[PDB]
Design a protein around this ligand. Structure first.
Ligand SMILES: CO[C@H]1CCO[C@@]2(C)Oc3c(C)c(O)c4c(O)c(c5c(c4c3C2=O)NC2(CCN(CC(C)C)CC2)N5)NC(=O)[C@H](C)CCC[C@H](C)[C@H](O)[C@@H](C)[C@@H](O)[C@@H](C)[C@H](OC(=O)c2ccccc2)[C@@H]1C
Ligand SMILES: [Zn+2]
Lengths: 49, 96, 195, 174, 1126
DNA sequence: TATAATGGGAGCTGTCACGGATG
DNA sequence: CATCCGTGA
């Protein structure tokens, strides 16, 4: 929902997500950049990290 | 303050969840004072609720030193930690 | 479509009573700040005029309820309270927006997130950075493909704490405070150090 | 009665008491009265004498009446005044770092000084404490009495001259 | 010659003889407008000269609409008349200096009429201090020169639109009635052949419902509109009948939620459309409706309101146009052309000038105090009522004050050059209140309309997102009393041109037929060919016999604007680059001293004069005395006027407004003659640049992709050097810990730093200042907070007691430097009137002498821009045979692409002008130079010439003149008939293999200099909320690494780079500090933490009743440097 | 805070292309 | 498959 809300229709994304009690596994590019984690690609993956 | 936490959950906040967040209820529309320029009590900036304006500086002036940490002044009820809390402490309004 | 709504409240023990509020939260003061400018005038956030709107009307209800006011007056206050909490949560959503001075729409809570200016696309997907600068560009047929001409003025502020480090290394300055002063005064020593 | 009262009570984003509002409205009244009399907007000195006879307060009153503006108001893709307001609170990087290096210089002072000597230093100045205890308590809370702790004070003040003669503390004052 | 009127330098012109009329006053758009507002003598004479019957001023009008002010009783009556001004409270120069508004106080005569007591009390009332407009056509609000731009709005009136239906594919016609202010009214036609009306965007109802509501019988409906089957189908499908049943029906759909009385439905139908209170068509609103319907066409403008006659005659206009009728006569009205109206046509598009814009704001204020008047009338007693007790001018003075500094109609005075002002004083913006927003404007509003010819320029308009919404007024145009744009045309009686000129409006011209300016004319006045080039309505053009010619253009250059006509060989450059060629001239910079261009267009004179940034002699006489300070003129009658020189003043944009006396002592000077010009002016001509010796060739790549190479001669001779002045300010206030005091004593500062101050703490005039240095030493009492125990210890060792005063000095901003050229100090002590709280205010002025360097943006008049790539030493420069090095090396590649080869022609004519020439007269006058006027058959070295747009030099004469090029001092010609010449590479010595095109070009210094543009930052200030860096060079902020840039990183797969940028480089409170320390200690960069901005989001969500919790791998809610507690 | 007084007042103008609920 | 409101550009 982090990736979705940070795209478009932010008021609609949150309304639905807060009702469905959607939990976000912070495992993606848009997801990680926001929280400040290393992005799960390139030199960020544990294989190389 | 480790960075790696697995999940982030969002849900609908209970009317009780609002109370469990807030360090007090705002009962006055006022923001600050017109002469003292200080956050008025039970107002939208009340230091009893959200925290001290200056680091370890209680409101009524009874405590002004870093020596008191976590002390709740009796004369106005202000905890003594940094103004770094006015960015994290919540309030609430009780609708009739 | 109705099921998609009702099925979501059944699964998680997430009560649908939440869609009606008995107590609204108030965002921390330093996120709705009030600042004095150099002109003496104060500059405040819009949430403080909407929080003030709600509290002013909510309290008036307490007075009118207590005084045993007729329903015609009490209900009116209730209705304004609805439009108040609404105007705070999402202004302009229902009806005409709340105008401040100069017929300007007040920034509601939800407005802090929406679109380009919203907290998302403008403060999370791309921020502003330290250790950075900008200037005009000029052709340089002398440089090799792995090189670029960086102005002596730009670089000194770019590597400022890296230069302060080596200034106190080679004893040009006695500490970190004075080494700072050297770079700001642009003493002739630093042009050898920065190189 | 209730309207005017409530209006003066609620309309101000920063609350001014009832009498204060009464003042400003009298100042706007006498101004408009002196406005048609002098074919010009009256000087601060002129307005003052008529109503309150004090020039200093009139300037002050006219600032109280000044209504605040909005941070979220804009000028431009996105103006937003609040995007120019500098956070006077946040900590300067270099200034915080230089303070820490001053702690590395006072650590090299707790050493040359004795254990008795580096004792009173952290006692009345309050380094680890955070509080400056009264000297007649310090000498009595320290196992050594007869206020020997003020006696060891002078046994240190000149011992501090050597790291002051090394000038390693001379640089951090200028 | 071209303009042989003032006493100017002789600029010879290739031209067909232009004697229609001189360029009318350029500044007249602002002047004539504001003169109408105050009803000045020059205007009432101008009203007389134009033959205007009974002229009413802008202020006079507002009073007559308002008057008389009566209550509901009709007992009391307040009215106003006879407005008058006093002298201005303070001269212009003092206003700019003491930051007050240039204004003259306004008075009116008010009388309180009472019908019961029959007595009248009449006296004079003060109305406030009224902002007056200068001679240069600007205003002065709070010490800064401002300018009111003219707005392009939709003119009120009735408009008809033909929309094509998607499904039925039939033609549907829609009408829309627009008041100046009031409710909406629009009649449209369905595909169902039923007529409907939408009132204020309410749902559609049959049109017969409205007629039966008016009181028109069901039989009269059959009469007036019976000639159509679509109206018979409407009255038939009509739901209900009855005068009562119609009013109720309309009431029910207009305002639901209210009890429908037969007396309440009758009432509002009167007020919403037929009362001056709720509804109002302006004088233009009435006049425009009348022209379209053709009723009361001769009768003077007395009605400001809509009528029933107009309603019916509008419905009649709709139905006929629907079934194919082309013409119609309204009963009681003259015949009118029936057709769909275009909204963008300048007869339906209105230009509201300065006067009306101020007038509208004034009308707003008079309505506010009228509301207070009607409240102060019912309160007070009848016998003690005077206009002084009724009138509260507070909302009036506020309304005018708000506008000049609260609205977007008061654009800042662009102070770039004598042309910058000029261009900016006359602008056509469709933006602003009453107009349109930027997102609302489609693609039709922006593009060039046919009616724009001779009225508004099609070239001059911004490049950016404002393109097409902003334009400049054409040179010869003017504004008529109704707010439309008129333009001059020569009158042809019968194939014979007459010097008699009449100004035409947009729609009026459409009814006529106009010939092109350059059409060949007999020496008497007749045409050459029967069929000539002809302009016609709707932008259509055809050949038409000479018997049908009504009018012809004044000038070839009639359609262009002021800055546009200053582009030599305009008709050789494509509109894309020619656009930029006009826009960039605006951003030229005033150099140390300025030269007039070798190639001109003639416009350079009148532009300089009408700029107001030169000194023009008022009355004829002789220079009695001249100094660098002032010029004194001894008139013929004996009186003496002295003109003071603006010397080294800072403009609005930090450029150098500096004036110098042209005339010597004892010169005979006539009226209107330039006796002293300003920045960017050489002998009373717009000098926007320098004449440079150009070379069209690639050179070692240093001019690759529009870059520019310069000769160091331009640095050693200051040819492109400029002066830039900055104003630095700082104040001392009253605080809670005491008061800020300006002193020479600043805590912990050596006497080496203070060395350039005086005893007060102010820098001394003439001193040198670099960045970081101190200008005004100020210290403030810092809060008595417990000083550090580690700094307490440090103050006992060296025994130095701490002062309670913190350094709050005014230091020089990063990048700035120069010589301190003046101090302005305002003290509350010395009775200088300051804002509440301020004691001493200091203004230090620092100028810089910026020579031209790498990265500075240069440009020509042909959209040929670019930055300085490299400035070689003078010897490295490609030089001609006689040793002379070229100044500027432009790249060949970037010329044919831009289609702006007028820069090439400028180079050819530019060389002929530098060398001089002489046509061969032996064996007669050659055939190519046969159209060349006599005065150009022989020219001196360094001669000045004119190439008027759509006239001037042609390619045949230019080629021939290249053969006429006079040899240098050594008796050798340097360029050929091709225009080329042979160069020697200053580096290798060997001659370049091929001939290179050499000549002179006019290059301007634009205001995009690296000294301003460059900026960097390690650490600095931070956002108060998001805790991110601040933004801008002014706040010393870092760059923005946007969403687009984070994709580039992500694509590369540089996680650690991307993480660092958004963490320890940004808003990690504890990180950026520990990064600074790790660097200065030489350790490794630590691991980033949590972005404080993300903490903000999780708190902003919480405030919205969204329980947001962070979970570790187990599932427990972990803290975020904080805790929850009830 | 005791004459009597009783239902508001500015609209806002020139988008555009699309999905989803309703026809 | 085509309209009305809200949301972006
Ligand atoms: C109050 O005035 C301001 C507007 C208000 O807002 C809007 C919504 O209404 C506007 C209206 C009604 C206009 O007609 C506009 C207009 O005509 C512009 C520009 C805009 C607007 C504009 C708005 O944006 N806007 C941008 C500005 C920058 N963003 C650009 C970004 C990418 C960097 C893009 C568009 N250009 N110019 C051009 O198109 C032509 C090509 C050339 C420019 C001529 C000259 C440079 C100019 O005359 C200045 C001397 C000065 O007049 C300007 C600077 C004013 O600033 C102070 O005067 C001023 C005075 C004191 C303090 C501060 C400023 C602005 C205008
Ligand atoms: Zn206390």
């Amino acid at each position: 929902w982090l990736s979705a809300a940070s795209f478009q229709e932010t008021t609609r994304v949150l309304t639905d997500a807060a009702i469905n009690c959607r939990s976000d596994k912070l495992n993606g590019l848009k997801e990680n950049v926001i929280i400040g984690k290393l992005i799960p690609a390139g030199t960020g993956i544990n294989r190389y990290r | 303050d480790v960075n790696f936490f697995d999940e982030l959950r969002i849900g609908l906040a209970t009317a009780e969840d609002i109370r469990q967040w807030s360090y007090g209820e705002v009962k006055k529309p006022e923001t600050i004072n017109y002469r003292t320029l200080k956050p008025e009590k039970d107002g939208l900036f009340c230091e009893k609720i959200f925290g001290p304006t200056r680091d370890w500086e209680c409101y009524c002036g009874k405590y002004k030193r870093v020596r008191f940490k976590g002390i709740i002044c009796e004369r106005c009820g202000v905890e003594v930690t940094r103004a770094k809390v006015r960015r994290e402490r919540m309030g609430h309004i009780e609708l009739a | 479509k109705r099921l998609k709504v009702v099925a979501a409240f059944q699964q998680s023990g997430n009560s649908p009573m939440g869609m009606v509020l008995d107590a609204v939260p108030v965002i921390p003061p330093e996120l709705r700040p009030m600042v004095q400018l150099d002109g003496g005038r104060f500059a405040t956030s819009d949430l403080n005029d909407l929080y003030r709107r709600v509290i002013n009307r909510n309290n008036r209800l307490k007075r009118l309820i207590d005084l045993g006011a007729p329903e015609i007056i009490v209900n009116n206050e209730k209705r304004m309270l609805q439009e108040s909490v609404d105007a705070l949560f999402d202004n302009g959503r229902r009806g005409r927006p709340v105008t401040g001075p100069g017929n300007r729409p007040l920034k509601s809570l939800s407005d802090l997130l929406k679109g380009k200016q919203g907290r998302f696309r403008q403060n999370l997907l791309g921020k502003r950075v330290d250790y950075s600068g900008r200037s005009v560009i000029v052709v340089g047929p002398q440089l090799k493909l792995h090189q670029c001409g960086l102005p002596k003025l730009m670089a000194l502020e770019l590597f400022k704490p890296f230069v302060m480090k080596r200034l106190v290394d080679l004893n040009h300055a006695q500490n970190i405070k004075s080494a700072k002063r050297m770079v700001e005064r642009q003493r002739p020593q630093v042009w050898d150090v920065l190189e | 009665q209730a309207i005017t009262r409530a209006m003066a009570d609620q309309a101000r984003t920063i609350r001014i008491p009832v009498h204060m509002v009464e003042v400003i409205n009298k100042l706007g009244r006498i101004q408009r009265e002196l406005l048609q009399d002098l074919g010009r907007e009256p000087t601060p000195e002129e307005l003052a004498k008529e109503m309150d006879i004090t020039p200093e307060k009139v300037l002050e009153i006219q600032q109280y009446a000044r209504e605040p503006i909005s941070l979220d108001q804009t000028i431009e893709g996105d103006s937003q005044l609040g995007d120019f307001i500098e956070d006077s609170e946040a900590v300067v990087a270099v200034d915080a770092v230089s303070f820490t290096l001053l702690q590395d210089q006072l650590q090299s002072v707790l050493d040359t000084l004795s254990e008795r000597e580096a004792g009173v230093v952290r006692l009345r100045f309050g380094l680890t404490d955070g509080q400056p205890r009264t000297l007649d308590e310090i000498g009595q809370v320290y196992g050594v009495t007869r206020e020997r702790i003020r006696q060891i004070e002078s046994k240190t003040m000149s011992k501090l001259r050597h790291p002051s003669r090394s000038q390693v503390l001379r640089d951090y004052l200028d | 010659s071209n303009n042989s009127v003032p006493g100017a330098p002789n600029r010879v012109s290739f031209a067909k003889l232009r004697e229609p009329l001189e360029v009318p006053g350029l500044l007249d758009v602002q002047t004539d407008s504001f003169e109408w507002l105050i009803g000045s003598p020059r205007w009432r004479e101008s009203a007389a000269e134009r033959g205007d019957v009974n002229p009413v001023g802008g202020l006079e009008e507002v009073l007559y609409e308002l008057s008389p002010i009566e209550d509901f009783s009709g007992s009391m009556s307040l009215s106003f008349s006879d407005p008058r001004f006093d002298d201005v409270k303070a001269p212009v120069d003092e206003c700019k200096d003491k930051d007050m508004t240039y204004a003259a106080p306004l008075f009116v005569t008010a009388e309180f009429i009472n019908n019961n007591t029959g007595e009248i009390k009449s006296q004079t009332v003060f109305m406030g201090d009224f902002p007056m407009m200068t001679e240069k056509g600007t205003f002065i609000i709070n010490g800064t020169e401002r300018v009111v731009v003219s707005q392009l709005v939709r003119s009120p009136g009735v408009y008809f639109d033909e929309t094509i239906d998607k499904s039925t594919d039939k033609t549907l016609h829609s009408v829309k009635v627009i008041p100046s202010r009031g409710a909406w009214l629009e009649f449209d036609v369905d595909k169902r052949d039923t007529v409907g009306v939408r009132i204020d965007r309410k749902r559609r109802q049959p049109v017969t419902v409205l007629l039966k509501a008016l009181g028109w019988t069901s039989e009269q409906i059959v009469e007036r509109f019976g000639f159509s089957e679509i109206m018979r189908s409407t009255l038939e499908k009509d739901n209900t009948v009855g005068t009562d049943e119609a009013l109720l029906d309309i009431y029910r759909k207009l305002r639901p939620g209210e009890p429908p009385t037969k007396e309440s439905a009758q009432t509002l139908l009167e007020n919403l459309f037929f009362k001056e209170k709720r509804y109002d068509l302006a004088r233009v609103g009435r006049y425009k409706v009348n022209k379209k319907l053709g009723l009361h066409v001769g009768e003077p403008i007395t009605s400001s309101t809509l009528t029933e006659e107009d309603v019916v005659a509008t419905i009649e206009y709709l139905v006929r146009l629907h079934e194919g009728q082309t013409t119609m006569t309204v009963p009681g009205g003259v015949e009118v052309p029936v057709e769909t109206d275009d909204i963008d046509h300048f007869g339906n598009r209105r230009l509201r000038t300065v006067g009306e814009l101020i007038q509208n704001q004034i009308r707003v204020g008079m309505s506010r105090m009228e509301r207070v008047v009607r409240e102060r009338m019912t309160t007070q007693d009848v016998e003690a009522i005077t206009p002084q007790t009724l009138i509260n001018i507070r909302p009036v003075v506020a309304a005018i004050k708000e506008f000049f500094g609260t609205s977007q109609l008061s654009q800042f005075m662009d102070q770039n050059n004598p042309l910058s002002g000029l261009t900016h004083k006359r602008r056509l913006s469709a933006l602003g209140p009453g107009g349109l927003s930027r997102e609302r404007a489609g693609l039709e509003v922006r593009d060039v309309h046919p009616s724009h010819y001779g009225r508004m320029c099609p070239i001059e308009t911004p490049e950016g997102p404002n393109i097409g919404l902003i334009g400049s007024l054409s040179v010869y145009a003017r504004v008529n009393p109704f707010g439309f744009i008129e333009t001059p045309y020569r009158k042809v009686v019968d194939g014979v041109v007459s010097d008699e000129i009449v100004y035409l409006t947009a729609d009026e011209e459409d009814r006529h037929v106009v010939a092109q300016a350059n059409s060949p004319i007999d020496a008497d006045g007749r045409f050459v060919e029967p069929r000539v080039l002809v302009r016609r309505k709707a932008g259509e053009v055809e050949y038409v016999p000479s018997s049908e010619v009504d009018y012809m253009d004044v000038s070839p250059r009639q359609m262009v604007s002021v800055a546009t006509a200053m582009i030599p060989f305009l008709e050789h450059d494509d509109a894309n680059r020619a656009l930029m060629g006009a826009n960039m001239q605006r951003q030229a910079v005033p150099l140390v001293r300025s030269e007039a261009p070798l190639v001109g267009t003639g416009m350079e004179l009148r532009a300089a004069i009408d700029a107001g940034d030169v000194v023009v002699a008022e009355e004829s006489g002789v220079i009695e005395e001249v100094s660098a300070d002032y010029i004194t003129v001894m008139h013929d009658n004996g009186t003496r006027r002295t003109y003071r020189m603006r010397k080294f003043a800072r403009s609005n944009h930090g450029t150098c407004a500096n004036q110098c006396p042209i005339v010597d002592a004892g010169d005979r000077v006539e009226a209107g003659q330039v006796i002293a010009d300003g920045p960017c002016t050489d002998d009373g001509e717009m000098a926007l640049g320098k004449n440079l010796l150009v070379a069209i060739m690639p050179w070692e790549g240093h001019n690759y992709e529009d870059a520019i190479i310069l000769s160091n001669r331009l640095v050693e001779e200051d040819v492109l050097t400029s002066i830039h002045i900055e104003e630095h300010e700082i104040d001392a206030r009253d605080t809670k810990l005491g008061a800020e005091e300006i002193t020479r004593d600043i805590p912990n500062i050596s006497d080496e730093v203070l060395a350039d101050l005086d005893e007060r703490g102010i820098v001394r005039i003439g001193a040198e200042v670099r960045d970081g240095d101190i200008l005004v030493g100020k210290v403030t009492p810092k809060g008595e907070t417990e000083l550090t125990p580690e700094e307490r210890l440090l103050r006992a060792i060296f025994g130095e007691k701490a002062r309670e005063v913190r350094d709050t000095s005014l230091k020089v901003p990063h990048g700035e430097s120069g010589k301190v050229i003046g101090i302005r100090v305002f003290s509350r002590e010395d009775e200088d009137e300051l804002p509440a709280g301020v004691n001493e205010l200091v203004r230090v002025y620092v100028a810089q002498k910026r020579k031209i360097s790498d990265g500075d943006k240069l440009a020509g008049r042909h959209g040929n821009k670019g930055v300085i790539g490299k400035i070689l030493p003078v010897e490295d420069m490609p030089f001609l045979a006689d040793g002379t090095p070229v100044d500027i090396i432009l790249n060949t590649h970037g010329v044919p692409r831009r289609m702006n080869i007028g820069q090439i022609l400028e180079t050819h004519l530019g060389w002929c002008a530098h060398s001089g020439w002489k046509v061969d007269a032996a064996k007669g006058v050659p055939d190519w130079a046969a159209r060349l006027p006599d005065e150009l058959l022989e020219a001196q070295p360094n001669a000045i010439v004119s190439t008027p747009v759509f006239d001037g030099a042609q390619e045949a004469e230019l080629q021939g003149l290249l053969s006429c090029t006079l040899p240098n001092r050594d008796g050798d010609v340097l360029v050929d008939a091709d225009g080329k010449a042979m160069l020697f590479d200053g580096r290798s010595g060997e001659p370049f293999p091929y001939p290179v095109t050499v000549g002179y070009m006019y290059i301007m210094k634009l205001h995009h200099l690296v000294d301003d543009k460059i900026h960097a930052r390690s650490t600095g200030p931070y956002s108060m909320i998001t805790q991110q860096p601040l933004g801008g060079k002014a706040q010393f902020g870092g760059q923005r690494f946007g969403e687009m840039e984070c994709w580039a990183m992500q694509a590369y797969g540089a996680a650690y780079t991307l993480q660092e940028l958004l963490t320890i480089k940004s808003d990690d409170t504890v990180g950026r500090v520990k990064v600074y320390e790790a660097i200065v200690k030489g350790e490794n960069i630590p691991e980033p933490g949590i972005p404080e901005s993300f903490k903000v989001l999780l708190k902003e969500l919480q405030s919205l009743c969204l329980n947001v919790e962070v979970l570790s791998s187990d599932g427990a809610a972990i803290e975020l440097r904080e805790g929850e507690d009830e």
